[PDB]
């Protein structure tokens, strides 16, 4: 049971992963900018296609009775997944970085055609970055009729370090630094932008209370003129974030117009009208925050979902690379080491399941469709069963 427990663990992951990934594959075609997830879904799909072939080798305890070409293709594909997934995640972190830090220069970059062009480069770079895997993917001459399928380094007693370090450096070290750097600039930019709108908004309230207590035409004009400058500044400051530009920009036409409505009355000296005209601005200010809070709540949902996808991958595979670097110092594995090594890989391959599953969970639109789709499909089958059940009564 112990020997056959491990193949069942990977089979459960592959079964869930294939089903889980196909769910996103079907749903998206029928958060992330609708592009990177599609490519990232394929990486799990392609990796899991070769998963059962690798499982049988573990079942055979060193048997690859499937072909030397299969060993070269499948092993490279498995080693390609770490480089492809992280680069796609790195691109997603970079893509969100440009959309929030350099929105003006990234307008042309974020295009449906341009994004697909970058993905093709990432796949090509992934295959280029796994060239050593291609060179030494030949069948291991296992004793007897069986043949092993691994990496045949020319000097395994000496080349083990550089091959292992190169994967960690490029697939787990470098992308984590870039992704983390991208997501600390974004959080600072978002915090600075959100602390700027409320700072400009607070300028309105302080001036707004002046006009209510203002008793002359001179004070009203100066108080309103400060409001308009902040209103224009806040209007231009809206164009600095992704989910804060196509929705928070239209309203400022009313706010600037109403200020101009009061400003013209202030210049004419009709202070009583000017105060009355300014009095209606409190309904604009009261509606300013609600759309701000609604948008600010939504921009945290986008950021958390984007980080959660990236964070899961670099957390599940973190313990595996701990042992991978540890085994460099400790060449001989112990009984606990084998259990830890098997356990770490199981956690690492759990990323196949979470990435489609967690993405659907952290959005109310997808689960609404799934609840809708499941019920109608079952009910359509039930009435089709009824179409046989009422037929059994009638037909």
């Amino acid at each position, epitope marked *: 049971y112990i020997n056959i427990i491990m193949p069942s663990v990977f089979g459960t992951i592959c079964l869930l992963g294939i089903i889980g990934n196909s769910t996103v594959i079907f749903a998206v075609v029928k958060n992330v900018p609708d592009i990177f997830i599609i490519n990232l879904s394929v990486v799990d799909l392609l990796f899991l296609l070769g998963m059962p072939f690798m499982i049988h080798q573990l079942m055979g305890n060193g048997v690859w009775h499937f072909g030397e070409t299969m060993c070269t293709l499948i092993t490279a594909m498995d080693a390609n997944s770490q480089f492809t997934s992280t680069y796609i995640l790195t691109a997603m972190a970079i893509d969100r970085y440009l959309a929030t830090v350099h929105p003006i220069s990234s307008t042309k970059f974020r295009k449906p055609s341009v994004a697909t062009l970058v993905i093709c480069l990432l796949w090509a770079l992934s295959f280029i970055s796994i060239t050593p895997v291609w060179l030494y993917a030949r069948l291991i001459p296992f004793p007897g009729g069986a043949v092993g399928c691994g990496i045949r380094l020319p000097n395994p007693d000496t080349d083990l370090y550089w091959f292992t370090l190169y994967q960690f450096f490029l697939a787990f070290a470098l992308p984590f630094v870039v992704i983390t750097a991208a997501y600390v600039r974004i959080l600072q930019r978002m915090k600075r932008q959100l602390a700027d709108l409320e700072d400009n908004w607070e300028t309105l309230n302080d001036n707004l209370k002046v006009i209510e207590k203002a008793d002359n035409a001179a004070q009203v004009k100066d108080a309103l003129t400060k409001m308009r400058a902040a209103a224009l500044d806040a209007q231009k400051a809206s164009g600095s974030g992704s989910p804060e530009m196509k929705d*928070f920009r239209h309203g400022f036409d009313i706010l600037v117009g109403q200020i101009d*409505d*009061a400003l*013209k009355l202030a210049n004419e000296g009709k202070v009583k*009208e000017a105060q009355a005209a300014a009095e209606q601005l409190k309904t604009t200010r009261n*509606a300013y925050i609600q*759309k701000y809070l609604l948008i600010r709540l939504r921009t945290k949902r986008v950021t958390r979902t984007a980080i959660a996808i990236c964070l899961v991958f670099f957390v599940c595979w973190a313990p595996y690379y701990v042992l991978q670097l540890t085994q460099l110092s400790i060449s001989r594995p112990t009984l606990t080491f084998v259990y830890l090594y098997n356990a770490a890989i199981s956690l690492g391959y759990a990323n196949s399941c979470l990435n489609p599953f967690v993405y659907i969970v952290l959005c109310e639109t997808f689960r609404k469709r799934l609840v809708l789709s499941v019920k109608i499909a079952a009910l359509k089958e039930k009435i089709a069963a009824l179409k046989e059940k009422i037929a059994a009564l009638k037909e």
Partner: antibody, heavy 122, light 107 residues
Framework: EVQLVESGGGLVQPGGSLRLSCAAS????????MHWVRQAPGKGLEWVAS????????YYADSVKGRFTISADTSKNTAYLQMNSLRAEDTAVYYC???????????????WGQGTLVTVSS | TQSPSSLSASVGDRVTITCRAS??????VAWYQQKPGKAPKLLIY???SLYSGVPSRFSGSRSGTDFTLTISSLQPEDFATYYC????????????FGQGTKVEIKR
């Protein structure tokens, strides 16, 4: 008494130009806010555009922004609605209404015109 | 999008016309009455104040995010379609009219 007499409505092919006029009597249009509200046959009231002649600020609805051009003529005490790129759904009855105060359009449009019918059909 | 609702009531009944907003309404709704083939007329402004020429029967309430227009004693000339001016939301149009509620004779 505030009276709002309108004209200019009639037949016009799609893509044509039709300037709707809203004559105003009993008040000065300069210190006011003239709003155009259209009601499609069998549908409810829908806002179109507004203008404040004293300040010059002009607002439009999203569905008609860039196609209409509302303006006012203080000399003739009339408000115009220049309609361009008319479509099939623009067929409605266009009222010109103003609130009691020029800044109280959120408290209701007290005074309403008689309304004019714009029929767009090829 | 949505056809105006139907509210059947007889003469002398106490009708309640309700319009629902997406946020907390704060004295930003006005009620219009439109008879068929006529321009709409204003009934209640500032959601609590009677309008000139409007009897005391019309009165505006406020129940959470829903604002209601109450007619204490329905009259034969009060059978028309009633439109509600939605409180302004950021980014929307300057003035937005809600769906009407047609009040019709009950039999």
């Amino acid at each position: 008494e505030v009276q709002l007499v309108e004209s200019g409505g009639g037949l016009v092919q799609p893509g044509g130009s039709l300037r709707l006029s809203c004559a105003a009597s009993g008040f000065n249009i300069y210190y006011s806010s003239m709003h155009w509200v259209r009601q499609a046959p069998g549908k409810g009231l829908e806002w179109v555009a507004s203008i404040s002649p004293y300040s010059g600020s002009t607002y439009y609805a999203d569905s008609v922004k860039g196609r209409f051009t509302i303006s006012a003529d203080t000399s003739k005490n009339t408000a115009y609605l220049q309609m361009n790129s008319l479509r099939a759904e623009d067929t409605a009855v266009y009222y010109c209404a103003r609130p009691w105060y020029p800044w109280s359009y959120w408290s209701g449009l007290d005074y309403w015109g008689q309304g004019t019918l714009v029929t767009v059909s090829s | 999008t949505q056809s105006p609702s139907s509210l059947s009531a007889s003469v002398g009944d106490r009708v309640t016309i309700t319009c629902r907003a997406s946020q907390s309404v704060s004295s930003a709704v006005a009620w219009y009455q439109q008879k068929p083939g006529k321009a709409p007329k204003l009934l209640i402004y500032s959601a609590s104040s009677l309008y000139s020429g409007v009897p005391s029967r019309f009165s505006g309430s406020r129940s959470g995010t829903d604002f209601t227009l109450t007619i204490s004693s329905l009259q034969p000339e009060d059978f028309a379609t009633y439109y509600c001016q939605q409180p302004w939301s950021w980014g929307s149009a300057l003035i937005t009219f809600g769906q009407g509620t047609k009040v019709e004779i009950k039999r």
